[PDB]
Write a protein that binds this DNA or RNA. Sequence first.
DNA 1: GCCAATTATATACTACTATTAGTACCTAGTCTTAATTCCG
DNA 2: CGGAATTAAGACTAGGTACTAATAGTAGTATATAATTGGC
Lengths: 186, 183, 186, 183
Amino acid sequence: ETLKLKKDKRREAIRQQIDSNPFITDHELSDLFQVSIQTIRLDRTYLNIPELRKRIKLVAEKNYDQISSIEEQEFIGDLIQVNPNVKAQSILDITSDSVFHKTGIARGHVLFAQANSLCVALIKQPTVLTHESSIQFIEKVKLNDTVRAEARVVNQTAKHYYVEVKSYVKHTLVFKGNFKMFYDKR
Amino acid sequence: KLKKDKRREAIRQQIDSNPFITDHELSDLFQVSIQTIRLDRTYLNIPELRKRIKLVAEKNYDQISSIEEQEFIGDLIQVNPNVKAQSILDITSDSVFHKTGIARGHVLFAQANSLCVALIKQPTVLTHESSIQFIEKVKLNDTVRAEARVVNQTAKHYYVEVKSYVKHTLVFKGNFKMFYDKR
Amino acid sequence: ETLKLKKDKRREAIRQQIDSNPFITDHELSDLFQVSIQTIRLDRTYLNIPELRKRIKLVAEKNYDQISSIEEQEFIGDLIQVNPNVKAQSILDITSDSVFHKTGIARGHVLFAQANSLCVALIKQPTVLTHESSIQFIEKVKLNDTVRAEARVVNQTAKHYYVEVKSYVKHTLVFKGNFKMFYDKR
Amino acid sequence: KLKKDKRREAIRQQIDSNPFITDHELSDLFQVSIQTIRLDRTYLNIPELRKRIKLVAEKNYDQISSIEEQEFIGDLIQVNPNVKAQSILDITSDSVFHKTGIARGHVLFAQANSLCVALIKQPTVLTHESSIQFIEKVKLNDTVRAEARVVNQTAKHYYVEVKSYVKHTLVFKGNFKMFYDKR
DNA sequence: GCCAATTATATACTACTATTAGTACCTAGTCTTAATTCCG
DNA sequence: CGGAATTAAGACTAGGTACTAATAGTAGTATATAATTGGC
């Protein structure tokens, strides 16, 4: 009886569904939203969403052009700035998936993952591997916080790179980590 | 200039080099009818343009949530509250560096940290400090058996020692300072 | 029996027609463009043009809220800057309607109109009337030129304001005008 | 609290203060039925909302081209090429300052300048210099009779004297230096 | 001169676009007639 | 309890919105069957 979603609300829900799954057909959207295929076609038109085949092409073209490297995909956080073998900075927005549901505090491994990722990105060498790490959780990182991690090369031997990581939330040190990165010119 | 077999070998290479090519474009490029390309692609088991584009799109899609978005890392096998606990982690393609095939540093720490939170049976448990060592390189398809033991316990902290193995080979060692509160 | 205007071309022509006459109905547009009233409604939707009654309201609301004064409507050119009874500057884009069709040169009265208008705007007094003017057309103002007129109060008696107008096109003096503006504090 | 006549008086003033008001809004404000509001507007000769909004929109609309976008200013009466010419200009509401009711300075100059271009029978005619005087105030509904006479002619210029009248009363005097070219 | 290879031709498909048509409903009225209140 | 004032009820309108439905056309195929050419 009550079609819960009005014109504007339905269109935003359609917009989000197409993003979430570009491989969806107008027929499936019509069944999901309990609206005519003609309404779905009108909705995509107004929202400037192209047809299925055009969406699939754009997804394939991004992958074919090789936009966003393997290095970018397997990295925790967003890399902001890199000075090879000198200093690097990454950011990490703390989402509901990173916090303990009961407390709303970020899990230990979340902050270490960003820190370790930053070190591998910082060292411009063929083979880079973490050998040792000494970490400290100064303050509780809570939900919706954005962690600004900065890594600096403090020392460099013939076999290792010594990195100091300092992570902040609104210029408040929340994490400190010392990294022993093994490096090889092969 | 190109005979049946030679043309097909050039068609398969052209489609491999550009999957976005149409049968019409191939007809003009090879100076042959559209019906021939349809027969050629059939013999070479090459699907139509739209099916080719879909496969390209489908390949770099279906991304599994990265380690920071994961709750318990690994599979919890045994737990003796505030005593000893053990978890198993199968190293999949998602855990290794594509180039080297070696597990990422944070992958093994994630399993260790997760195991510590599971081991301490208290209302609020938080990691305060950790000192970790990567003894051996954990490679693809290895199964990491992590074992955590409570070594000390103060009024505010729990001291845990984690030892991770691949068969009977120590690959990881970690010391954990777990803060605990009975509130 | 071809319909000269395609989807995109028709929509631009519709947009311009509604801009030129907001009082137009969807029925007239359907007849003018030789398409169905439904296509017209679809076109306005995509172009984010509201219905007739909503358009008429917006026209009435602008007029009611006193947006653009009577003084601003009776003015030749666009008033850019005013320092009451000191210095003022107006702009005038030379359109096809301002030039002699054969030559492409602006008509004499066009430049004087902008100059005179600027003087009335410059003098902040209840009653302002032009009594005398001495003007000179230094260079030929052609089509598509933008005339930058600047008026300055050079003298002021008990009954008059003496204004010097200098009009330029890309920093080239094209017009010079001396104005004797009568003023009364009534 | 408000009787028939008193309510209508207040309704008339409310619609005058806000023409965008609906009959529904008036029914709630005056604590009376919509049918009554409809009867009130009828007796007060007030049209419906949509008709009221249209009249507001229509008033500040339908604008004629400003003097700078006009070719010949006035109506050309008589022309004796390169000798004497006369033009007539009826001073409409569009030519006067709304508040004073006096014709704008540029209106009378426009008629004068236009008359000079019409007077000189040459391929290219351009105003080079002009010295003008506004003797009397030209008001709304006056008809300006402008007469231009060629006083001198050089190899490059035509010297014209313009005298504009209302009734028989000199309101404008102008001296024009018109450049002329045979090519 | 045969058969394999190649082209022509005729049918259908999916997932659309662009356009036409048509329904129910909306606002803010109209115009009419009928019933029912206040108030003196 | 009367008539003037007021409200209620019913039937219509313009210029739409919002939605459903359906058609011709489209790309880039498919399936199958026939007819023609080219190569030894």
